[PDB]
Amino acid sequence: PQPRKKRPEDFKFGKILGEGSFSTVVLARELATSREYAIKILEKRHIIKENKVPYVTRERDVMSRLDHPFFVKLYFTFQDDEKLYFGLSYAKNGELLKYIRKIGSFDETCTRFYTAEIVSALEYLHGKGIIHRDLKPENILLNEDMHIQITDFGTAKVLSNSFVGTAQYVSPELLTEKSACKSSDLWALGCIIYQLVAGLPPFRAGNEYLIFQKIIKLEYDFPEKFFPKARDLVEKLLVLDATKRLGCEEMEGYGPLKAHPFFESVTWENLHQQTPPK
Numbered sequence: 318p319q320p321r322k323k324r325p326e327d328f329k330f331g332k333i334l335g336e337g338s339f340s341t342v343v344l345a346r347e348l349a350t351s352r353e354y355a356i357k358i359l360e361k362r363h364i365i366k367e368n369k370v371p372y373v374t375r376e377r378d379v380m381s382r383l384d385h386p387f388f389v390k391l392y393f394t395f396q397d398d399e400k401l402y403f404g405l406s407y408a409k410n411g412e413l414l415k416y417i418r419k420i421g422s423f424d425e426t427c428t429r430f431y432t433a434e435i436v437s438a439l440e441y442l443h444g445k446g447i448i449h450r451d452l453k454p455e456n457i458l459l460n461e462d463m464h465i466q467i468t469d470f471g472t473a474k475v476l477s478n479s480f481v482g483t484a485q486y487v488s489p490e491l492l493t494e495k496s497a498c499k500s501s502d503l504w505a506l507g508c509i510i511y512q513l514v515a516g517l518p519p520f521r522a523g524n525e526y527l528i529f530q531k532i533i534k535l536e537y538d539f540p541e542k543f544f545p546k547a548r549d550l551v552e553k554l555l556v557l558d559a560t561k562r563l564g565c566e567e568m569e570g571y572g573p574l575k576a577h578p579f580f581e582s583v584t585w586e587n588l589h590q591q592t593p594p595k
């Protein structure tokens with residue numbers, strides 16, 4: 318016996334946090350409780366016309382399965398005659414990409430802390446047989462406590478090859494076999510760790526085709542003063558042979574990955590309870 322289904326009038330919608338091709342996320346305050354939520358609004362007709370029902374269904378069905386501090390929580394859903402509403406946690410501190418730009422380049426203490434939270438959050442995701450398929454700093458929010466909260470699960474996939482995330486994070490197997498697996502998220506991770514230290518992602522070029530070209534030839538390099546243990550880590554994630562990436566079952570999973578020297582001082586059992594380095 319769950320709470321009465323909620324409805325638009327139960328809210329006071331405010332500013333639009335963002336707009337996508339198929340949806341709009343708007344900050345709303347629930348009148349009855351003063352709770353502030355990020356409500357994602359999708360227009361049924363548009364979804365139907367562009368054949369996205371499988372995607373909206375999936376996004377909903379994945380988020381309902383997640384119950385972990387490093388993921389945006391789906392509190393509720395409801396719909397009217399024209400739209401679909403998803404009540405989501407409202408991460409007050411924006412996205413990780415904003416910070417990367419804002420401060421430019423993370424030092425080692427922050428690079429290590431944030432990477433760890435991400436590794437820790439994927440281990441959970443991948444433990445449930447789910448792959449994100451579009452991991453990036455824009456999709457890794459920061460709550461008011463500055464801990465991470467990953468979102469954007471519409472493109473996710475539950476295990477038992479129709480999508481491609483953002484070009485600069487696309488794995489090479491995705492560009493040759495047309496099929497993503499856990500490996501693709503580990504590749505993205507490697508890219509992100511590189512981006513935290515260097516200030517920018519590893520593969521960059523004038524258009525997408527040129528980016529894809531670099532990815533499959535593994536064409537990138539590290540700056541001169543890139544933390545050595547971080548570099549080593551990235552070199553073990555950005556590996557063309559998917560089955561040889563730290564974290565993959567073929568490489569014996571997250572045990573080895575979390576054991577990397579780069580994470581020597583990390584206490585994995587409760588990152589959520591530690592204080593993020595300011």
Ligand SMILES: CN(C)CCCn1cc(C2=C(c3c[nH]c4ccccc34)C(=O)NC2=O)c2ccccc21
Nearest residue numbers: 334335342355389405406407408411455456468469
């Ligand atoms: C990449 N952009 C457009 C924003 C970051 C990605 N993103 C944030 C969010 C979320 C939040 C956002 C938090 N700030 C935002 C600004 C623009 C759009 C969304 C948000 C939020 O508080 N909770 C979210 O789930 C989100 C939800 C579904 C799909 C992608 C989402």
